[PDB]
Design a protein around this ligand. Structure first.
Ligand SMILES: CCCCCCC/C=C\CCCCCC(=O)OC[C@@H](O)CO
Ligand SMILES: CCCCCCC/C=C\CCCCCC(=O)OC[C@@H](O)CO
Ligand SMILES: CCCCCCC/C=C\CCCCCC(=O)OC[C@@H](O)CO
Ligand SMILES: CCCCCCC/C=C\CCCCCC(=O)OC[C@H](O)CO
Ligand SMILES: CCCCCCC/C=C\CCCCCC(=O)OC[C@H](O)CO
Ligand SMILES: CCCCCCC/C=C\CCCCCC(=O)OC[C@H](O)CO
Ligand SMILES: CCCCCCCCCCCC[N+](C)(C)[O-]
Ligand SMILES: CCCCCCCCCCCC[N+](C)(C)[O-]
Ligand SMILES: CCCCCCCCCCCC[N+](C)(C)[O-]
Ligand SMILES: CCCCCCCCCCCC[N+](C)(C)[O-]
Ligand SMILES: CCCCCCCCCCCC[N+](C)(C)[O-]
Ligand SMILES: CCCCCCCCCCCC[N+](C)(C)[O-]
Ligand SMILES: CCCCCCCCCCCC[N+](C)(C)[O-]
Ligand SMILES: CCCCCCCCCCCC[N+](C)(C)[O-]
Ligand SMILES: CCCCCCCCCCCC[N+](C)(C)[O-]
Ligand SMILES: CCCCCCCCCCCC[N+](C)(C)[O-]
Ligand SMILES: CCCCCCCCCCCC[N+](C)(C)[O-]
Ligand SMILES: CCCCCCCCCCCC[N+](C)(C)[O-]
Ligand SMILES: CCCCCCCCCCCC[N+](C)(C)[O-]
Ligand SMILES: CCCCCCCCCCCC[N+](C)(C)[O-]
Ligand SMILES: [Ca+2]
Ligand code: NA
Ligand code: NA
Length: 430
């Protein structure tokens, strides 16, 4: 029971993916296995503490062993690599509240929805968590991937600074109301007209502010004592973007200029979960990120730090809010969701999730997704998905996570009728 100074997490993962581009491009499917080793070190001395976690990965192909991985020349991952995941120092002595502390270094930033921040990033982050009042404030920026195989940052991350904060209160037992803010500022520059544009150039620079209000009733508490749980959130995105314009000239992309415009967009996510008994749960969700509008002003996007993974099905396992296969970003996207889940004590859980997805504006792209295929102008029907997650907890666990995506009319002729992405993870902690 003495404070544990080190450990090692060992994960074996298999991934089957077919076909991310729906058959539109060559190869690019996965059926592969890998091991991921994460040694960690922790020290604590009165109000001070410090932590390091590293990572070594070897796999048969470039599979996803980390749900929080950076998305990917200079950005080509290798089948095997080393990385530094977290390295930070923490000071808890500003106040006597044990849930209050200040953390500096590359660290896990997470809030419960996963929709604003859920990532490892260099940050200075203040947390204040007590029974009646929670608050946080921080700043973050990526300076490197800290990986042996990736030499450059993604253009969206380069020179982008994040500032954010939140504050919330438990106004009745198990019911929380709060506000949340995030601001992203780009100090980079766009290619100038006539310059060649490649995959490591920015497509835009922005100064963007998200302002959100969030109500939850054990939304993400898998151990809730209430028969009904819920989440409701509404988020306003404002600010501006300078968008790069380009043209094609001889199989090469050339910058032609740029266009600025204000953003005035809106996102909402609602959910209701029935705690039917000690084991069974089921629920419904609706979410929408606005799209299109006059000069793209209504195109909602997320912060870029989000995972969209959360305990929304009411289990210990986190699930992708917009599908393991589709992996939607809330951006010109409407989603309806139904789920059921089962758990037995701390020993097993399982969730079955259905989604239907539509575009909001049928002449605009959606944001990120786990699908790499062009949408047909004028078609709103993105598709449907069924997901299954099943876990046995032995510390250690073994989990199946799978999604089956059925493309709708927005994907069109010559695309596959079905696509899946599935994982098995076996994890042991020493
Ligand atoms: C701004 C980034 C800060 C990065 C700090 C990285 C911290 C690295 C490793 C965490 C553990 C350091 C422990 C150092 C140490 O000698 O601890 C004494 C320990 O043996 C018993 O308490
Ligand atoms: C230990 C506690 C210290 C608190 C330090 C102060 C933290 C400051 C701000 C936290 C809230 C995030 C700020 C969001 C923001 O400033 O941008 C909005 C603005 O750009 C709209 O145009
Ligand atoms: C209770 C039913 C579970 C619902 C399905 C959730 C599991 C998701 C994926 C399982 C792997 C299926 C892989 C084969 C398949 O169905 O599609 C073939 C297609 O991907 C060819 O491109
Ligand atoms: C308390 C002192 C000990 C600190 C822990 C040392 C652990 C060993 C390595 C930490 C990770 C340093 C990696 C830095 C790095 O990868 O450089 C990134 C490049 O600049 C690429 O942009
Ligand atoms: C502009 C009108 C917006 C009205 C929104 C009202 C939302 C009402 C109910 C949604 C769920 C609220 C739960 C409140 C609740 O259960 O707490 C009451 C206390 O537990 C009393 O013991
Ligand atoms: C397919 C590869 C392995 C991935 C699967 C990991 C989870 C495996 C099995 C979980 C089984 C879920 C049902 C458990 C059940 O019905 O009751 C458990 C018993 O009551 C306790 O022994
Ligand atoms: C021992 C278990 C090895 C396989 C674990 C599941 C990952 C594929
Ligand atoms: C024990 C559970 C068995 C079901 C696991 C499903 C994993 C997906 C493998 C499907 C591969 C088929 N194909 C040809 C589409 O790649
Ligand atoms: C059931 C869903 C998880 C898929 C597991 C993926 C298969 C792992 C082992 C087969 C791949 C190894 N190999 C030989 C193709 O490199
Ligand atoms: C456990 C499976 C580990 C597989 C990693 C090895 C892949 N490699 C480098 C040999 O092609
Ligand atoms: C000990 C072997 C370490 C191999 C590291 C992955 C390639 C860099
Ligand atoms: C602005 C972001 C502040 C991040 C400071 C954390 C230091 C971690 C290593 C950075 C080099
Ligand atoms: C198992 C822990 C390993 C920790 C060290 C990993 C950091 C190495 C990063 C080197 C980056 C080299 N690069 C990308 C500039 O070519
Ligand atoms: C509007 C501002 C809402 C979040 C403010 C957080 C303040 C830092 C504690
Ligand atoms: C929604 C705004 C909630 C902020 C909590 C501030 C009240 C403190 C008692
Ligand atoms: C959604 C529920 C909103 C409840 C707001 C808190 C009222 C407290 C008096
Ligand atoms: C406490 C936050 C509640 C957020 C609920 C948002 C629903 C907005 C529906 C669109 C109204 C026009
Ligand atoms: C209860 C209060 C909930 C506020 C939701 C209002 C949504 C309106 C969003 N919009 C379209 C005006 O930007
Ligand atoms: C599609 C999922 C939507 C929510 C499911 C609703 C669950 C209602 C369960 C009623 C069962 C009443 N019972 C069995 C406890 O006496
Ligand atoms: C596939 C297996 C899904 C998980 C089992 C849930 C139903 C067990 C009821 C006792
Ligand atoms: Ca392909
Ligand atoms: Na403290
Ligand atoms: Na629950």
């Amino acid at each position: 029971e003495a404070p544990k100074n080190f450990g090692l997490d060992v994960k074996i993962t298999g991934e089957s993916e077919n076909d991310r581009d729906l058959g539109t491009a060559p190869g690019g499917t996965l059926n592969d296995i890998g091991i991921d080793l994460r040694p960690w070190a922790f020290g604590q001395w009165g109000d001070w503490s410090a932590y390091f976690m590293g990572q070594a990965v070897a796999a048969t192909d470039t599979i996803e062993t980390d749900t929080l991985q950076s998305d990917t020349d200079g950005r080509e991952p290798d089948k095997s690599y080393l990385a530094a995941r977290e390295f930070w120092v923490d000071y808890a002595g500003l106040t006597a509240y044990p849930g209050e502390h200040l953390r500096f270094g590359r660290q896990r930033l997470r809030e419960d929805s996963g929709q604003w921040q859920d990532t490892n990033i260099e940050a200075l982050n203040w947390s204040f968590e007590t029974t009646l009042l929670n608050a946080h404030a921080g700043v973050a920026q990526r300076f490197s991937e800290y990986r042996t195989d990736l030499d450059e940052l993604a253009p969206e991350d380069k020179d982008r600074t994040h500032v954010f904060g939140d504050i919330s209160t438990q106004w009745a037992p198990h019911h929380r109301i709060g506000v949340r803010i995030h601001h992203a500022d780009d100090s980079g520059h766009l290619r100038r007209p006539g310059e060649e544009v490649d995959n490591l150039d920015k497509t835009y620079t922005g100064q963007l502010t998200w302002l959100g209000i969030e109500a939850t009733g054990d939304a993400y508490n898998y151990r809730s004592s209430m028969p009904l749980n819920y989440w409701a959130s509404a988020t306003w995105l404002t600010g501006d973007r300078d968008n790069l314009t380009t043209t094609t000239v001889d199989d090469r992309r050339i910058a032609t200029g740029k266009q600025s415009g204000d953003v005035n967009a809106f996102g909402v996510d609602l959910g209701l979960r029935w705690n039917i008994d000690e084991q069974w749960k089921a629920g419904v969700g609706y979410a929408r990120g606005s799209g299109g509008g006059k000069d793209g002003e209504e195109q909602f996007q997320q912060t870029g730090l989000e995972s969209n993974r959360s305990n929304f099905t009411g289990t210990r396992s986190r699930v992708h809010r917009f599908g393991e296969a589709f992996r939607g970003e809330l951006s010109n996207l409407q989603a309806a969701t139904l789920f059921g889940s089962w758990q037995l004590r701390e020993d097993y859980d399982a969730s079955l999730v259905y989604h239907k997805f539509w575009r909001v504006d049928d002449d605009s792209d959606i944001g990120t997704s786990g699908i790499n295929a062009a949408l047909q102008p004028g078609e709103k029907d993105i598709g449907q998905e069924l997901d299954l997650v099943v876990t046995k907890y032995f510390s250690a666990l073994i989990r199946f996570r799978g999604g089956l995506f059925k493309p709708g009319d927005a994907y069109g002729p010559g695309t596959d009728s079905t696509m899946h992405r599935a994982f098995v993870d076996f994890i042991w902690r020493f």
